[PDB]
Design a protein around this ligand. Structure first.
Ligand SMILES: *[C@@H]1O[C@H](CO)[C@@H](O[C@@H]2O[C@H](CO)[C@@H](O[C@@H]3O[C@H](CO[C@H]4O[C@H](CO)[C@@H](O)[C@H](O)[C@@H]4O)[C@@H](O)[C@H](O[C@H]4O[C@H](CO)[C@@H](O)[C@H](O)[C@@H]4O[C@H]4O[C@H](CO)[C@@H](O)[C@H](O)[C@@H]4O)[C@@H]3O)[C@H](O)[C@H]2NC(C)=O)[C@H](O)[C@H]1NC(C)=O
Ligand SMILES: *[C@@H]1O[C@H](CO)[C@@H](O[C@@H]2O[C@H](CO)[C@@H](O[C@@H]3O[C@H](CO[C@H]4O[C@H](CO)[C@@H](O)[C@H](O)[C@@H]4O)[C@@H](O)[C@H](O[C@H]4O[C@H](CO)[C@@H](O)[C@H](O)[C@@H]4O[C@H]4O[C@H](CO)[C@@H](O)[C@H](O)[C@@H]4O)[C@@H]3O)[C@H](O)[C@H]2NC(C)=O)[C@H](O)[C@H]1NC(C)=O
Ligand SMILES: *[C@@H]1O[C@H](CO)[C@@H](O[C@@H]2O[C@H](CO)[C@@H](O[C@@H]3O[C@H](CO[C@H]4O[C@H](CO)[C@@H](O)[C@H](O)[C@@H]4O)[C@@H](O)[C@H](O[C@H]4O[C@H](CO)[C@@H](O)[C@H](O)[C@@H]4O[C@H]4O[C@H](CO)[C@@H](O)[C@H](O)[C@@H]4O)[C@@H]3O)[C@H](O)[C@H]2NC(C)=O)[C@H](O)[C@H]1NC(C)=O
Ligand SMILES: *[C@@H]1O[C@H](CO)[C@@H](O[C@@H]2O[C@H](CO)[C@@H](O[C@@H]3O[C@H](CO[C@H]4O[C@H](CO)[C@@H](O)[C@H](O)[C@@H]4O)[C@@H](O)[C@H](O[C@H]4O[C@H](CO)[C@@H](O)[C@H](O)[C@@H]4O[C@H]4O[C@H](CO)[C@@H](O)[C@H](O)[C@@H]4O)[C@@H]3O)[C@H](O)[C@H]2NC(C)=O)[C@H](O)[C@H]1NC(C)=O
Ligand SMILES: *[C@@H]1O[C@H](CO)[C@@H](O[C@@H]2O[C@H](CO)[C@@H](O)[C@H](O)[C@H]2NC(C)=O)[C@H](O)[C@H]1NC(C)=O
Ligand SMILES: *[C@@H]1O[C@H](CO)[C@@H](O[C@@H]2O[C@H](CO)[C@@H](O)[C@H](O)[C@H]2NC(C)=O)[C@H](O)[C@H]1NC(C)=O
Ligand SMILES: *[C@@H]1O[C@H](CO)[C@@H](O[C@@H]2O[C@H](CO)[C@@H](O)[C@H](O)[C@H]2NC(C)=O)[C@H](O)[C@H]1NC(C)=O
Ligand SMILES: *[C@@H]1O[C@H](CO)[C@@H](O[C@@H]2O[C@H](CO)[C@@H](O)[C@H](O)[C@H]2NC(C)=O)[C@H](O)[C@H]1NC(C)=O
Ligand SMILES: CC(=O)N[C@H]1[C@H]([C@H](O)[C@H](O)CO)OC(C(=O)O)=C[C@@H]1NC(=N)N
Ligand SMILES: CC(=O)N[C@H]1[C@H]([C@H](O)[C@H](O)CO)OC(C(=O)O)=C[C@@H]1NC(=N)N
Ligand SMILES: CC(=O)N[C@H]1[C@H]([C@H](O)[C@H](O)CO)OC(C(=O)O)=C[C@@H]1NC(=N)N
Ligand SMILES: CC(=O)N[C@H]1[C@H]([C@H](O)[C@H](O)CO)OC(C(=O)O)=C[C@@H]1NC(=N)N
Ligand SMILES: [Ca+2]
Ligand SMILES: [Ca+2]
Ligand SMILES: [Ca+2]
Ligand SMILES: [Ca+2]
Lengths: 388, 388, 388, 388
């Protein structure tokens, strides 16, 4: 077992091909399935796992009532092989209402945040044991990525924020070796609010695309140097912006450096990645709600401010159907590093009042150098047939 | 771990012996069990797995209503060790309403087709990662074997069709190395319609027996050369024909080359294999419906046009009970390659209107060089005791 | 991985200590648990597994009605790690209404009998593949041990019977190498009826204690020489006899050679083993019914005809509670071979008419060279609280 | 695989960080989950497992009625990976109404006590086989730790008691090598009543902190020398005492040697460990009931009689919520041995009469050298929403 270095070129990407779907809401109506939100995917050198924050209950269960809330002492991080739905034999790997996980080539790191809003604790669990912890620095909901961290040569990086959801906050990037925090770098650069980073290896460093919850509907970028620990930050250049809410495609803007101040408050976790001058990105189809999901390439979208020249659109979830969070993960192939993404498909309250609970299923796609057609892969639960 | 070459002689076969049964419909009445159809069996060098296309629901579940339909975005390929029924802890290995899987000696390949009828995508997943994809070439339900593919020296072959179910279509044979499509050969030869191939290693190549959905109640043969990529095709010589529907045993014919034009439209997935001049084959007992299942050898049935000299009949499922799809798989023994087969036992709509769902169980037999008796191994669900 | 030779002395035994219990009937009232009978235990070099013949249904299931019957096409052999109850994720390793399993040091052999009463088939499955089969020789319920077979230096032995349950029958001992039948020896010697043998390694050969269903309430012994394939047989010398039904302890007899002709018809699977001149044995406490279970040593019970000098009695199941089948298994320790046994605890019809089903749980004890106390470990299901 | 020696220094501890929670009571209301009590945690060199004494039933099950009782023949020791709740696929590793388990670096030892109150048997199971047993010496509820044993260089130690719960009893320390009892040392020293020891490696020996059920609300210490087999004992010096019941913090006392005679009768399993002159310890917040759970360091609490100088308090379970048993486990890191603890969260009768059953969930924390905040992690079941 050697440490991952991710020192291969990024794979050619012509778009994305179907990879996985768990259909967990449909199954919940005829089986004991965990209530979840904030899912993600991360893979060890051999195989992929799906993760989510449990609500400490199954769906067909009186405890599922009012599971819309984000933070309780009963939330734990679930971990199954990808494609295995969260049944009662699912392992809860730590106590968490915010998490990030990654494999360094040798073992799994889990970063798990729980406790009081005003004084939370993050535990660092590596190779099945607790190695480190840190208390809240700003005493206002310490929180992390809700997707995979990234490790190079045994140094794993994870982005965490503490402080306001609607003003300047204190974001820090932790460097972790075999579960031990060896360095913490405060955020630097021009990103003005950073949450829920979707990070990927871009040898020799790590690159993240995140959520600005304050003034931006354009997505922040954070670049992390694992050798000198320097942090830089800015915004995705693309004038087709990635956050929800946002303005329409003709009114939206981004000039690469500053929050656009266009329906900037609130947000959704999302992702994008660079290919030379171009960007690949996903987003909800709706500009207001977490409904629909589309991916596309913006020509010049990485290096040219405010570019809106799109190509290679794919519908992942049709506009009539609910989506949610999305995030990136990276998979090492024979000769290149591939980029994949998941979409959380949220069902229940508050939007759907037919039931009392709030949960999600997942759908997953991976980059391809081949060809593909079209479809739509929504949750598929019939809200009127569900246990309430 | 070395690549499979399958370079051993075929085992002596005197008939088939019971190997596995999952009883999943009976269990569905008292437990959370997936709704499935189109099952199959494939084995790695150590052990066998059962596969099926899920309907994204369990049977005792309101979502099981009207699961007769062939293609939805909720269908996924299930994979368990053979004999483990599709319980809620079953892994969904990809999104699929048509699939083929095989192990090359080192890792599993899955071929999975999903998306719009008119523009489907096939994903190629090898060793737990997406390696390739292809879009629909004829824009009319791209589809594949619904049974195991076959790999020799690391080249895996899979037969796919796109186009009409009731006229000339575009069948292609893909050659896949570690999940990457390295070559695609169009169908050639005298088979006029080819679907749902049951393929087996016949060193140095691959041989398939398939479904003609158009003009043949005789089964097509496709031979695949993995070195020069040439394809040839014809029909099983046996005058006792293998498809359903078909004419009676006295009226039926085949002359080895052309569809017989005898109740040729429609069909069922099935199998046959050669032993010198003789053929072993299975088929439904009913000539009209997917009811009963019998196996036998036809003396001269491989090389003599229209031979009807049968011997070594076995009843697998009595004529009063429902069958369905069937297919071949191959298992490497100490000194020879054995041939085995599964039978899908379909229950529910449209034939049985007592329930709203459509599902199946499975029964599995393997070739033997020993002796055996008689029996009948049907599904065993009591349609009047089932959840509706 | 080397073949087991079992070439160590038998461990010192002062009695038996509790090893396992699965409590499956109690669990069946609040969970999806298989309906079973005829359970047994066998261990690979590392760990033990529990086995049973399923009835192709869970208990809380309409299909559990009238599961008293011995033989159906839905019965399969279940296999879990010992102590894991037969939940819905349990593997069905073959189709069987009669079975025997054993590990040769390298891999598992399963012997599985299914099909028509008058023309059954036994499949031989080794290392996950079908290697051999044999048809019924006497056309009257081919059947086997319902407990572990035994392998020495890669030759596995299994005792099978075909023919009358109430007159002279045709018993044969099969010698099996990597799943292939290499030799079959007919029963020889003075045992007049032999069923359901409980066999154990007694280097350099195999020794079995069985059920006489015809004229004996004394238990037959069959000795198997794995080098020259010779079979000899007689009866356990002990005047305290092991079968049910039987006469009382003062009226019972055995003189080592012939069936005692004392309430000889019918029987129950059971076990005994030798220690020099002494015998260890178990039996039901009731002389008429399968109720209670006791173990003891008979001083002189192996070599002295009709000895009744007992010592070291233990109650395993109190006389007020139901038992059933019992059988031996052997476990290799550091320096000796230990002997253990299981007891099937049968619940339901026909004896208990409060429910419609027939099932069992299990309890397991192992020989000890240490000390122990007393107890009683019955099924524990409350028949009046069970699903019907 | 080498034997554990635990020959590293104890880790720096500044307090404890969240590690695991299973939420099993909440899940029990919508899924088949075992009824348990007396849980614990023990880890092999790679990963941690959770253990508990089952009641031979799931919670949503008529057999769960009146599961308040401590000892039945249906109780078994359950073992899952830590964080996997006790679902129906959980392994029952032995028959037990009292247990201790530990891994010696090569294999698992289980110590399991069952049978009649007046004549119980303890089985010693190592590497999946029964190696030894001992009968009750004092004929009055032979019993053990209900938490992990400890092994050094292949010698495992376990503390057992037989005799009165309310007067002088017969405690013995067993030394076990590969499952075989090689030596038994009677308790010696000034501890006057010793039950339910929480033991940890303190190279070159083993140290335990236990429950005095008779005259002490201060906790006994037992030190075990694994080389010369000598036993010494006393009481934790801290004037803030660890048992429940106890007097208030101002009235309580301990002078290190003798039971304090302060509300000494009854007790709860608990833990403490030394760091030079200081002690870390947990206890219920309530002085009368098993409610709340707090941890803290007492400065001088190991070596200075009656010290009450506390620092580094953490609330684990708020005072309004139920706790129960607690115990220590040790985890080997890169350069030091860490100390962790679990808390049993008891729900149901007799305290909560809304339901008929008695069960528990668990929460687990590990020592940290980092920082942390605050929270409360109670069971979380709504007693008014539970199946009864
Ligand atoms: C079977 O499946 C395949 C694979 O999914 C699918 O092919 C894909 O089709 C989509 C939709 O057409 C393609 O994505 C589009 O790409 C165009 C640019 O490509 C065209 O123009 C260039 C340059 O001239 C040519 O080289 C090229 O050949 C094409 O002709 C983008 O313009 C598209 O974006 C617009 O349309 C979207 C809706 O489709 C809008 O959502 C989006 O906002 C854009 O609209 C606005 O921008 C336009 C200018 O960009 C302008 O007209 C207005 O401002 C407008 O309002 C979109 O990204 C994708 O590349 C194809 N994939 C591949 C690999 O070929 C097949 O269509 C499908 N067949 C069926 C019937 O199912
Ligand atoms: C216990 O279990 C064993 C194993 O399953 C079983 O033995 C098997 O019996 C079946 C049924 O008889 C055998 O299969 C048949 O084989 C004959 C040919 O074999 C005979 O003829 C040759 C050549 O002269 C002899 O060497 C040989 O010894 C036999 O006498 C086929 O003719 C059979 O096919 C016909 O009958 C079927 C129904 O059984 C029809 O479905 C089928 O359509 C065929 O019917 C038509 O063809 C006939 C000419 O072929 C002619 O009469 C008419 O056209 C007719 O309508 C069938 O394949 C099988 O070989 C045996 N297996 C072995 C290994 O021996 C025992 O019977 C069983 N016992 C019981 C009581 O359960
Ligand atoms: C705590 O747990 C331990 C371990 O389980 C338990 O000890 C065991 O007790 C049983 C029951 O007494 C013992 O088994 C009996 O052994 C005697 C022979 O031993 C005695 O005699 C010899 C020779 O003189 C002495 O060396 C020895 O010290 C003993 O005194 C057998 O006779 C017993 O069989 C008879 O009684 C059974 C009921 O207990 C009947 O079911 C059985 O049919 C026998 O009855 C008939 O035979 C008698 C002559 O054999 C005669 O009296 C009449 O014919 C009669 O009707 C039985 O096998 C066992 O050896 C002990 N185990 C060990 C290791 O010591 C403790 O008793 C237990 N304590 C409590 C209170 O729970
Ligand atoms: C965010 O999260 C952090 C980490 O959990 C938390 O910090 C921790 O706070 C607790 C509670 O204050 C600290 O534990 C206490 O420590 C004091 C001793 O520390 C003080 O005094 C020393 C010596 O002068 C100073 O060096 C040091 O800086 C501190 O000022 C103990 O006295 C505390 O025990 C008493 O209070 C408890 C309730 O909090 C009682 O339950 C307990 O019985 C004690 O009460 C009695 O004793 C007193 C003297 O000891 C005396 O006043 C009376 O007799 C009294 O009745 C307690 O152990 C802990 O050390 C902090 N942890 C760290 C690592 O700093 C933050 O508070 C938290 N913030 C929020 C708002 O959530
Ligand atoms: C995209 O949003 C812009 C900005 O709101 C829309 O432009 C406005 O449209 C209304 C008429 O519907 C006018 O009264 C306003 O003067 C416009 N505002 C500005 C600032 O231009 C535009 O219509 C939207 N485009 C689409 C296609 O919906
Ligand atoms: C097999 O099918 C053939 C073809 O239909 C049947 O032959 C027909 O039988 C009817 C009488 O029932 C006659 O009126 C027709 O003239 C026949 N047609 C031909 C073309 O021969 C034959 O009877 C069937 N055999 C069996 C055993 O059912
Ligand atoms: C054991 O069984 C024998 C054989 O039946 C019993 O002896 C019989 O008892 C009855 C009186 O109850 C007499 O009328 C018969 O003459 C006896 N028959 C013989 C052949 O002796 C004996 O009583 C039984 N022993 C016990 C303890 O139940
Ligand atoms: C702790 O317990 C002590 C001992 O009972 C309490 O002291 C008693 O308090 C009552 C008044 O409430 C007096 O009448 C007794 O004289 C006291 N007894 C002794 C022996 O001192 C003390 O009040 C308790 N402390 C707290 C904070 O509850
Ligand atoms: C720690 C926490 O509660 N994070 C929140 C997150 C957060 O409110 C925003 O990013 C603003 O800061 O929003 C959302 C959301 O759906 O918008 C869900 C997350 N829920 C959970 N991770 N549990
Ligand atoms: C891709 C697809 O829908 N294939 C069909 C197949 C097909 O309709 C015929 O071969 C004609 O082309 O028929 C059947 C069938 O039962 O006849 C089931 C298959 N269902 C699934 N594989 N899902
Ligand atoms: C193959 C078969 O049916 N064997 C029978 C067995 C048999 O009837 C007797 O030994 C007489 O021959 O009896 C019993 C029994 O409980 O007495 C159960 C077995 N049931 C099963 N193994 N399924
Ligand atoms: C063997 C046994 O029954 N031990 C008891 C234990 C015991 O009563 C006291 O320590 C007094 O001796 O108390 C308790 C308790 O909750 O106080 C539970 C234990 N239950 C179980 N381990 N099953
Ligand atoms: Ca925003
Ligand atoms: Ca056809
Ligand atoms: Ca008999
Ligand atoms: Ca006490």
């Amino acid at each position: 077992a050697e440490y991952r270095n991710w020192s291969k070129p990024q794979c050619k990407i012509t778009g994305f091909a179907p990879f996985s779907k768990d259909n967990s809401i449909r199954l919940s109506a005829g089986g004991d399935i965990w209530v979840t939100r904030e899912p993600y995917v991360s893979c060890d050198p051999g195989k992929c796992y799906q993760f989510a924050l449990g609500q400490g209950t199954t769906l067909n269960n009186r405890h599922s009532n009012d599971t819309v809330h984000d933070r309780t002492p009963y939330r734990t991080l679930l971990m199954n092989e990808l494609g295995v739905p969260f049944h009662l034999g699912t392992k809860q790997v730590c106590i968490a209402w915010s998490s990030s996980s990654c494999h360094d080539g040798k073992a799994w790191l889990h970063v798990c945040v729980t406790g009081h809003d005003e004084n939370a604790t993050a535990s660092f669990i590596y190779d099945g044991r607790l190695v480190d912890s840190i208390g809240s620095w700003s005493k206002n909901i310490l929180r992390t990525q809700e997707s995979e961290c990234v490790c190079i040569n045994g140094t794993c990086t994870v982005v965490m924020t503490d402080g306001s959801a609607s003003e300047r906050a204190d974001t820090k990037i932790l460097f972790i070796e075999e579960g031990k925090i060896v360095h913490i770098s405060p955020l630097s650069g021009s990103a003005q609010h950073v949450e829920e980073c979707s990070c990927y290896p871009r040898y020799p460093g790590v690159r993240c695309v995140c959520r600005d919850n304050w003034k931006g509907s354009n997505r922040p970028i954070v670049d992390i140097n694992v050798k000198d620990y320097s942090i830089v930050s800015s915004y995705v250049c693309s004038g087709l912006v990635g956050d929800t809410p946002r303005k329409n495609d003709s009114s939206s803007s981004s000039y690469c450096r500053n929050p656009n101040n266009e329906k900037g408050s609130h947000g959704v976790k999302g992702w994008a990645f660079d290919d030379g001058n171009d960007v690949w990105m996903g987003r909800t189809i709706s500009e207001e709600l977490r409904s629909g999901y589309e991916t596309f390439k913006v020509i010049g979208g990485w290096s040219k401010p405010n570019s809106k020249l799109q190509i290679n659109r794919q519908v992942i979830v049709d506009r009539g159907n609910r989506s949610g969070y999305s995030g990136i993960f990276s998979v090492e192939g024979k000769s290149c590093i591939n980029r994949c993404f998941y979409v959380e498909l949220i069902r229940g309250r508050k939007q759907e009042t037919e039931v009392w609970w709030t949960s999600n299923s997942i759908v997953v796609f991976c980059g391809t150098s081949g060809t593909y057609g079209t479809g739509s892969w929504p949750d598929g639960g019939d809200i009127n047939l569900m246990p309430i």
